[PDB]
Amino acid sequence: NIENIGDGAEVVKRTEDTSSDKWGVTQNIQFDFVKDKKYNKDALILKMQGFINSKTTYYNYKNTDHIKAMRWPFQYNIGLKTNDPNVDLINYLPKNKIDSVNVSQTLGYNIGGNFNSGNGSFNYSKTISYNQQNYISEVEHQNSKSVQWGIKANSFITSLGKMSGHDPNLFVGYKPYSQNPRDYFVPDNELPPLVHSGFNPSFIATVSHEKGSGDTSEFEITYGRNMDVTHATRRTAGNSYLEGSRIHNAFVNRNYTVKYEVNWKTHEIKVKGHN
């Protein structure tokens, strides 16, 4: 679909969808080519959406009756890179450390290659919107060829008051005598959506390409998680309770990576490969 955005400019919209049962990921990518006569560069707006399954599991610790485990996502990973020397990452959203429950931001474009991370005054716009209850979003790394976000366990309200994402007693349950590993941890109504279900990413990246320097560019988009393990141990003025201990970053970069090829002249998208 083509959208006129004013005098001598239009936007060509394309979409690519890929899922992985191996990683528990759906990448829904929107590629919006900005074709403007008044802008000396080819420009692409990437809206990265979809789903990253939390893959939260509860299992018994070995051959014990009293140590049970919760493997859960400490952090979600969102990354974008290019290997094209003619392509520059010019902007991305969210840009700064944000801890609000809902992250809702707008990228605005104006004829002449003017991008603003602030609608109606613009010729074109794209909006990101995602929930990250109890998590914080931040840029882990960035350069002219890449941007990487971390959406990590941050602040939680528990039965023992406020807890950090690093507290070993985080998510520890109320049933020390149950044989069900799920019972050793707080119920789903006490867990944030990012733990019980997964993450619905909504991220933006704008890339610029030098006019007539090459018809194609490759982009690698990575969606994943880093898993923590919480062990809940039964402890025994004769009552029993549960105590947590943590293996932080027990499983890092459990990521689904997809390589996309973009054609700047034809506006066609191809999935080159994936893991």
Residue numbers in the entry: 3 to 120, 126 to 243, 246 to 284
Authors' account:
With the exception of α-hemolysin, which is homo-heptameric, leukotoxins are bipartite toxins, formed by the non-covalent association of two distinct proteins, a class S and a class F component of approximately 31 and 34 kDa, respectively, into a likely octameric species. Panton-Valentine leukocidin (PVL) is associated with necrotizing skin infections, such as boils, and plays an important role in the poor prognosis of necrotizing pneumonia. Two additional structural domains are also found: the rim domain anchors the protein to the membrane surface, while the stem domain, closely apposed to the core β-sandwich in the soluble form, contributes two β-strands to the pore β-barrel. Since the binding of LukS-PV to the membrane is a saturable process, the necessary presence of a LukS-PV receptor on the cell surface was thus proposed. This was recently confirmed by Spaan et al. who showed that the C5a receptor is required for the binding of LukS-PV to human neutrophils.
Five mutants (Y181A, K182A, H245A, Y246A and N248A) were partially affected. LukS-PV mutants Y181A, K182A, Y246A and N248A also had a significantly decreased calcium entry slope, from 65% to 75% of the control (p<0.05, one-way ANOVA). The T244A, Y246A and N248A mutated proteins crystallized in identical conditions (50% PEG 200, 0.1 M MES-NaOH, pH 7.50). The corresponding crystals belonged to the P43212 space group, with similar cell parameters (a = b∼94 Å and c∼308 Å) and 4 molecules per asymmetric unit. These crystals diffracted X-rays at medium resolution (2.50 to 2.80 Å). In the case of the rim domain, wild-type LukS-PV and mutants T244A, Y246A and N248A displayed only small differences, with r.m.s. deviations comprised between 0.20 Å and 0.30 Å, whereas the structure of the rim domain of the Y184A and Y250A mutants were markedly different, with r.m.s. deviations of 1.10 Å and 1.28 Å, respectively, when compared to the wild-type LukS-PV structure.
